[PDB]
């Protein structure tokens with residue numbers, strides 16, 4: 329897995345499973361639109377809801393890792409992310425869904441990204 333953290337502490341690791349298109353990667357503030365299958369090393373899936381997940385990148389509206397990783401994706405890319413708790417829900421955790429010092433995995437597909 330590739331370390332994409334700025335401290336280089338291996339807190340978020342990434343493998344590209346399906347390569348995306350174009351050459352623009354999404355800027356801070358972009359409305360970004362994804363599918364995801366995700367879990368702790370309890371599985372949660374957008375395909376469960378029947379509906380894409382959407383947020384504004386870099387506004388800390390998701391855990392610190394997602395803003396980092398989804399920033400390194402490109403349209404159509406599917407990626408695998410592995411996340412130490414300091415870039416996820418910490419030593420506080422986020423009970424009941426997440427315990428203390430929980431490591432997390434997602435499969436993410438970046439569907440599209442537009443402009444904010």
Ligand SMILES: COc1cc2cc(c1OC)OC[C@@H](CO)OC/C=C/[C@@H](C)[C@@H](C)OC(=O)[C@@H]1CCCCN1C(=O)[C@H]2C1CCCCC1
Nearest residue numbers: 364366367368370371372381389390391394422425426432
């Ligand atoms: C801590 O509680 C949850 C965690 C997670 C999902 C979740 C949680 O309960 C609300 O509900 C499902 C989604 C779908 O609409 O709700 C919106 C998410 C809001 C954001 C702010 C937080 C909660 O999520 C995230 O930052 C990340 C990344 C985006 C996708 C969801 N993700 C999670 O951490 C998941 C968590 C749930 C169990 C398996 C591991 C991932």
